[PDB]
Each structure stands twice: as structure tokens, then as C-alpha cells.
Amino acid sequence: QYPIINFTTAGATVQSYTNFIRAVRGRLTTGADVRHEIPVLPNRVGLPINQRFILVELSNHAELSVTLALDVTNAYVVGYRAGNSAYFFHPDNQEDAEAITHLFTDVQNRYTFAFGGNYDRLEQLAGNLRENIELGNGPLEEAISALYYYSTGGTQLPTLAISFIICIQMISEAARFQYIEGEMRTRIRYNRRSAPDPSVITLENSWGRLSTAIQESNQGAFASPIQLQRRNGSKFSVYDVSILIPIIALMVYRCAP
């Protein structure tokens, strides 16, 4: 079976969340490939199927549970299981369509959505941009509940998109960036619910671009600057890998060292 990591919103804390995100990182990559001190996720090309996914098992105080499937090469959430039903986003290609057939093979019901799981599609379905969708333990507890009830007709599709958007950021983006991990920890700590600010959003949007520039850097110096965004919306340039060490935790594979 694929590796399983567990988290619950029941009595969640900064530490239990931190431990969770650590475990997820530890399974996403062995971490034997490190450029400029940043771990690289494993390459898509040679990767066999028994090693391509991890399962993230989310439960509530309501005592209902849901299992997300993460693509190991990108921490991308490709689908999920709730009870006897399993749902997948529209894959990008037949390689991927093929891969996902080894997931949740024992569930009595399997569905592939007509829509992919990129943010923009999900936003159009949710009827809300990321910047207007609250994150925190409350939202995550709500997200898990919405996903659980989808198969029985009790969750409208927009709410399902909203819930996916929450899970992706609190899990896959938090694993991608210590920065976003820290953002969620603060909300857990103070029991607060808030949309992500432009520093979070722009990091999410530019993860691919940042992976390329780091791996193509000249001893850490980017071949050209990457504009990011501060909390207050203003644009600033990063020129080197060093500034990002405490900010990005993982990188998609871009090429060989």
C-alpha cells in the first residue's frame, strides 16, 4: 500500500500540525537530491507506480474521515476517498490517467470529474478566488466534512471546490513552503480564520518558476530576478536562492544536476 499520514482537526495544535506537515514532507521525498540546500521531489520520468503517491488521512472531531491522494513528484492533490466512493480530477494526460488507476483500488465507486484540479478551474466552480476563501482549522474541519458528504448528494459543487482549495493550501502548499506552513500555524495558534494575503498567493503561483530558477541558478544567483509580493500587495525582486532557504521547502524536479 501507499504511505499514509494522518491528521485530525479535533484538538489540533501548532505542534500536531507541524508534526503532520513534517511527516508529509518526509514521505513526499527521501531528500537525497538537494540543490543549493533545497530538497527536490522525485523525477516523473523514471518513477514507478508503487512509489508515486502518498495518502493523507484527514479526520474531524465529528469523527468522519477522508483520504487525499498526493502526487509525489509535485505534492499535487489528484483525488480523494470518502467511504465507498473515490473521486479524481480530470488528468492532464494518459500517463497520469493510467497512474491514478492504482489508487483506492478497493472502493466500490470510482469517478473522474469533467474538470481538472488547477486553482483557476476550482475558483470558477467555487465562485470565489483564493483571496476570499478563509483558511484555518475551522475551514479545514468544514472542508473535510464537505468532502465526506459529497457522495451522498449533501454537498453542492461550489462548496466542494471551496473545500478542495482549502485542503490544497493547508497541505500541499504548506508542505511546499515553510512560509505557508507558518501561516497556517499562526491561525491554528490564535484560533483564527482568514483568507491568504498576497505573499501567500504569489508564492503559490510562482512555485514552478522558483523551482526552475533555483535549479538553473549560478551557485544560487538567479539568471534573472523573480518578482514576488509582500503582505500588503507590493512587488519586490528576489535575486538569489539564499533569501528563500527559510521560505521554500521542496521543488519540482526540473532537470539533472
List binding-site positions for AMP.
76-77, 117-119
Closest C-alpha to 131, from 210, 205, 236 = 205
32, containing H or E segment: none
Q: Contact, 187 vs 169, CB < 8 A?
A: no
Nearer to ligand EJ5, 188 or 201 (CB): 201
Select the residue interacting with ligand EJ5 from 33, 76, 129, 212 (CB under 6 A): 76
The answer to whether residue 142 forms part of the interface with ligand EJ5 (CB under 6 A) is: no
Minimum CB–partner distance for residue 130 and ligand EJ5 (Å): 10
- For residue 209, indicate whether it is catalytic: no
Select the residue interacting with ligand EJ5 from 30, 51, 84, 118 (CB under 6 A): 118
Q: Which residues are part of a known binding site?
A: 4-6, 11, 46, 76-77, 117-119, 137-142, 191-193
Nearer to ligand EJ5, 123 or 141 (CB): 123
- For residue 119, indicate whether it is catalytic: yes
The answer to whether residue 253 forms part of the interface with ligand EJ5 (CB under 6 A) is: no
Which cell numbers in the block locate residue 211? 523551482
The answer to whether residue 80 forms part of the interface with ligand EJ5 (CB under 6 A) is: no
DSSP-H helix ranges across the chain: 14-28, 94-99, 119-126, 137-149, 157-167, 174-176, 178-190, 198-205, 207-215, 241-244
The answer to whether residue 30 forms part of the interface with ligand EJ5 (CB under 6 A) is: no
Residue 224 CB burial class (10 angstroms; 0-12, 13-18, ≥19): exposed
Closest C-alpha to 130, from 205, 74, 80 = 205
The answer to whether residue 55 forms part of the interface with ligand EJ5 (CB under 6 A) is: no
Closest C-alpha to 122, from 181, 169, 86 = 169
The answer to whether residue 75 forms part of the interface with ligand EJ5 (CB under 6 A) is: yes
Query: Residue 79 is which amino acid?
Result: G
Among 81, 176, 185, 187, the active-site one is 176
- For residue 176, indicate whether it is catalytic: yes
Select the residue interacting with ligand EJ5 from 207, 222, 241, 248 (CB under 6 A): 207
Whole-angstrom distance between the N-terminal and C-terminal Cα of the chain? Answer: 31
- Note the residues at the interface with ligand EJ5 (CB under 6 A): 74-77, 117-119, 168, 172, 204, 207-208
Active site residues: 76, 119, 173, 176
